[PDB]
Coordinates of C-alpha atoms in Angstrom, one line a residue:
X1 CA 0.0 0.0 0.0
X2 CA 3.0 2.2 -0.3
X3 CA 4.2 3.2 3.1
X4 CA 5.6 6.4 1.9
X5 CA 3.2 9.3 1.3
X6 CA 5.4 11.6 -0.8
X7 CA 5.6 11.8 -4.5
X8 CA 6.0 14.6 -7.3
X9 CA 5.4 14.6 -11.1
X10 CA 5.6 17.0 -14.0
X11 CA 2.7 18.1 -16.1
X12 CA 3.6 20.3 -19.3
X13 CA 1.3 23.2 -19.9
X14 CA -0.7 23.5 -23.1
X15 CA -1.9 26.9 -24.4
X16 CA -5.0 27.1 -26.5
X17 CA -5.8 30.3 -28.5
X18 CA -9.2 31.6 -27.8
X19 CA -11.0 34.6 -29.5
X20 CA -11.1 35.9 -33.0
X21 CA -7.8 36.9 -34.6
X22 CA -7.3 40.7 -35.1
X23 CA -7.6 41.9 -38.7
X24 CA -4.5 44.0 -38.2
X25 CA -2.6 40.8 -37.1
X26 CA -1.5 38.2 -39.6
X27 CA -0.6 35.6 -36.9
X28 CA 0.4 35.2 -33.3
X29 CA 3.0 33.3 -31.4
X30 CA 3.8 32.3 -27.9
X31 CA 6.8 30.9 -25.8
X32 CA 7.8 29.6 -22.4
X33 CA 10.8 29.7 -20.4
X34 CA 10.0 26.3 -18.7
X35 CA 6.4 25.4 -19.4
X36 CA 6.8 22.8 -16.9
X37 CA 5.8 22.8 -13.1
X38 CA 5.9 20.3 -10.3
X39 CA 2.7 19.0 -8.7
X40 CA 2.4 17.0 -5.3
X41 CA -0.7 14.9 -4.1
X42 CA -2.1 11.4 -4.5
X43 CA -1.2 9.2 -7.4
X44 CA -4.8 8.8 -8.5
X45 CA -5.1 12.5 -9.1
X46 CA -1.9 12.8 -11.1
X47 CA -3.1 9.8 -13.2
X48 CA -6.3 11.8 -13.9
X49 CA -4.3 15.1 -14.9
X50 CA -2.4 14.6 -18.2
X51 CA -1.7 18.1 -18.8
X52 CA -2.7 21.7 -17.8
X53 CA -4.7 23.8 -20.2
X54 CA -3.9 27.5 -20.1
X55 CA -6.4 29.5 -22.4
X56 CA -5.5 33.1 -23.3
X57 CA -7.6 35.9 -25.0
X58 CA -5.9 37.2 -28.3
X59 CA -8.8 39.5 -29.2
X60 CA -7.4 42.3 -26.8
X61 CA -3.8 41.5 -27.9
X62 CA -2.7 43.8 -30.7
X63 CA 1.0 44.4 -29.4
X64 CA 3.9 42.4 -28.1
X65 CA 3.7 41.9 -24.3
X66 CA 3.8 39.2 -21.4
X67 CA 1.4 38.3 -18.5
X68 CA 1.8 36.2 -15.5
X69 CA -0.6 33.2 -15.4
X70 CA -1.4 31.2 -12.2
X71 CA -2.1 27.5 -12.4
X72 CA -4.4 25.6 -10.0
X73 CA -5.8 22.0 -9.9
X74 CA -8.2 20.2 -7.3
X75 CA -6.5 17.2 -5.8
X76 CA -2.7 18.3 -6.1
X77 CA -0.7 21.2 -4.9
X78 CA 0.8 23.1 -7.9
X79 CA 3.8 25.1 -7.2
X80 CA 5.3 27.8 -7.9
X81 CA 2.6 27.4 -10.4
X82 CA 3.7 30.6 -12.0
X83 CA 5.5 31.1 -15.4
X84 CA 6.2 34.0 -17.7
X85 CA 4.7 33.8 -21.3
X86 CA 5.7 36.3 -24.1
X87 CA 3.1 36.9 -26.8
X88 CA 4.7 38.2 -30.1
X89 CA 2.2 39.9 -32.5
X90 CA 2.9 40.0 -36.2
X91 CA 1.8 43.0 -38.1
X92 CA 0.2 42.5 -41.3
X93 CA 2.0 44.0 -44.2
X94 CA 1.7 43.6 -48.2
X95 CA 4.6 42.5 -50.2
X96 CA 5.5 41.0 -53.6
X97 CA 3.2 38.2 -54.6
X98 CA 4.6 34.6 -54.7
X99 CA 5.8 33.8 -58.3
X100 CA 5.1 30.0 -57.6

């Protein structure tokens, strides 16, 4: 029954773009310094969590910036549960048409 009562695992974060893309933006990208955090709790809870979804609104995003996002899950203790995310915005600009 496992005498020990201590365990830790890693759950990569998955960002899902939510909202309509700005008409003045061709495309948006995102990155992370680690994109991985340590969780502590029962093995059953860990087996249930395969990853942490972190949705972000891009509709209000029209310029390059970064925001701190806190992660929480019921059944495990997420810590530091904080990561920095940089959102680069690409400005649309016409150019020479592709010959191909």
